[PDB]
From Swiss-Prot, chains A, B:
Gene3D superfamilies: L-arginine/glycine Amidinotransferase, Chain A. It is linked to Cerebral creatine deficiency syndrome 3: An autosomal recessive disorder characterized by developmental delay/regression, intellectual disability, severe disturbance of expressive and cognitive speech, and severe depletion of creatine/phosphocreatine in the brain. Most patients develop a myopathy characterized by muscle weakness and atrophy later in life. Fanconi renotubular syndrome 1: A form of Fanconi renotubular syndrome, a disease due to a generalized dysfunction of the proximal kidney tubule resulting in decreased solute and water reabsorption. Patients have polydipsia and polyuria with phosphaturia, glycosuria and aminoaciduria. They may develop hypophosphatemic rickets or osteomalacia, acidosis and a tendency toward dehydration. Some eventually develop renal insufficiency. FRTS1 inheritance is autosomal dominant. Changing D107N: Complete loss of activity. It comes from Homo sapiens. One chain folds into a compact single domain composed of repeating units, five beta-beta-alpha-beta modules, which surround the central active site. This is Glycine amidinotransferase, mitochondrial.
């Protein structure tokens, strides 16, 4: 079976890497506004529905081709989504929208064992994102993998908190503490990236795009073999867990200094090593439209002792080096603008290893 | 758990019954043309996209309200889809269309144990049909049921045989013999009604709307607990199996005289009773837009000795009576026009019983 991955560190053999092509600025709706930094609001207000800066996309394409070259050298089979125009306007009975991109496979696909799971998504601009990956998924299906598509939400207004403290309010930390974000509990919804795998245990975070209904759906779908746990952090704008609590080895995790975990004791007690990375060195003047600066810790492990880290982040490189971890430096400064690091731009289809417990 | 049904005959306790409201004539595309009798082509060519005759829909609504009254008297909890306007035009990146109806729950939902499964569908006009049932499904989910949505196809041209012997060709029997219909094997697709449950064994038929990919998806999704078997019949236009091979009891099945099963020996050898019903008596002048006359055998079992049969079909009533089966006569002559009998207008959510084997 081509599909087989139980965690984030076993020897990588096959991966899907996203595309920067035809990426489009999402329409500036409630859920998009909730994610965007004040700094970029004008960009969104004017660019919404049109392609992200073509000059920038050309550089991102270049950067990702090089990253694929390197993965190939490291002995990894690379698959890529199909090219699609994300500017096509679609209309369901509940809403109308233009698309985003197929840059982040991690956002939409998660592999648990020999099964590929397509997350429902929570953003209107990402409703039909799965279309880019069907050619790859049908092939794995023909070859034996299990294929599951979690329930696709209606994404009706009812799913969003029309009156969320968007604009700037920060007490959104208070709602955050109450497990309350821009998505309601109207229907299940989640991005695959809010889940991070550690064998028989999977950790999930209730974020702006992943609700309790979505988490419960996964937990209930993977039981009894896998245990899905919920963990939270200090963060007024959570979306995906891989730039907050990135698990890089059996009992080793990278915890974002700015986003501490309320349940860190579960891990200290289990005898896990909690490493806090150094601060990103990316200039404040570089466009990070969909994200924070912490993409530096969004690393991808080729195996336990090999990490693909950003060429520009020397401090985090040094940290891995003192730990005895071989750093493979790839530069993706421009691809970073679309919202992800290596963990986000990929989806590990097959790693060599077995289903085990590490919290045990 | 509200959801619990392993076969078609155990004591019925809860059911979803469809709605005739706002039903719309589907656009006359390849897959629709393949299903429609020459007789109704003008009706489709002119009515496509508009509501089915309002005068007729009013009678169907009346008939179904009475059927719900009766189910209530028989001690069955009745749930109904939410009212929706099926005339709304939607547009995915692959196609554009108007809707059909939420009259046939059997077409889209199937319950295996404590799990509700939403079929992907194969008709463009039925892409968003699931929207009518989400309120009911979320409630069962909150109450403990498992909820699965099979992969939703793109329904791109590639899924359909643009040059299928539609118009009238009959050698479509030859393709039929080759397992070839109007849907290709491009991506998985199926209507839930092509599957019929008998405990640990489920029988499926490759039809115009259910391909081998769709069958394989189910088989692979329900293994190891349930065995999905494929069976075929003499039929140049298969769609749903419940008016062809309707299983009404442990080891008892109604086989359509005109649609014999190529694998009938599996059943004779298992010691099953194969009953062939009498011919329908519905007048040839009554509009049967979406179906054949055989809706008469599309019965619904309240339990092993109680069947809900059409008030007008005396001959089939007599047959059940000689068998010691109590007939509950409900008239749905007009609802028949939308395409189904009792088995089609409903979906059994809960029946009292256990998972057993009957082929054993
Ligand atoms: N899979 C992903 N797209 N991960 C990116 C995480 C970025 C995170 N929301 C941040 O701003 O730090
Ligand atoms: N679940 C259903 N809609 N069943 C109806 C089956 C009708 C069948 N295609 C016929 O013409 O005999």
């Amino acid at each position: 079976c081509p599909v087989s991955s139980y965690n984030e560190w076993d020897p990588l053999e096959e991966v899907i890497v996203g595309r920067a092509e035809n990426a489009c600025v999402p329409p500036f709706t409630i859920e998009v506004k909730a994610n965007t930094y004040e700094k970029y609001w004008p960009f969104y207000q004017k660019q919404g529905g049109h392609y992200f800066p073509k000059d920038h996309l050309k550089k991102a394409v270049a950067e990702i081709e090089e990253m694929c070259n390197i993965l190939k050298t490291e002995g990894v089979t690379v698959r890529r989504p199909d090219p699609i125009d994300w500017s096509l306007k679609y209309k369901t009975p509940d809403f109308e929208s233009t698309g985003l991109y197929s840059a982040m496979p991690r956002d939409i696909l998660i592999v648990v064992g020999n099964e590929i799971i397509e997350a429902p998504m929570a953003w209107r601009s990402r409703f039909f994102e799965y279309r880019a990956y069907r050619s790859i998924i049908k092939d794995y299906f023909h070859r034996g993998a299990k294929w599951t598509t979690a329930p696709k939400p209606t994404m009706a207004d009812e799913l969003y908190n029309q009156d969320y403290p968007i604009h700037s309010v920060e007490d959104r930390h208070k709602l955050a503490a109450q497990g309350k974000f821009v998505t309601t509990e109207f229907e299940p919804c989640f991005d695959a990236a809010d889940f991070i795998r550690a064998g028989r245990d999977i950790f999930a975070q209730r974020s702006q795009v992943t609700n309790y209904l979505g988490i419960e759906w996964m937990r209930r779908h993977l039981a009894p073999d896998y245990r899905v746990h919920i963990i939270s952090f200090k963060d007024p704008n959570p979306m995906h867990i891989d730039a907050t609590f990135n698990i890089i080895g059996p009992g080793i995790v990278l915890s974002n200094p700015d986003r501490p975990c309320h349940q860190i004791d579960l891990f200290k007690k289990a005898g896990w090593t909690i490493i806090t990375p150094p601060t990103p060195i990316i200039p404040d003047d570089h466009p990070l439209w969909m994200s924070s600066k912490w993409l530096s810790m969004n690393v991808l492990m080729l195996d336990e002792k090999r990490v693909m880290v950003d060429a520009n982040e020397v401090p985090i490189q040094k940290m891995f080096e003192k730990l005895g971890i071989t750093t493979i430096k790839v530069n993706i400064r421009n691809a970073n603008s679309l919202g992800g690091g290596f963990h986000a731009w990929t989806c590990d289809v097959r790693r060599r290893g077995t289903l085990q417990s590490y919290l045990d």
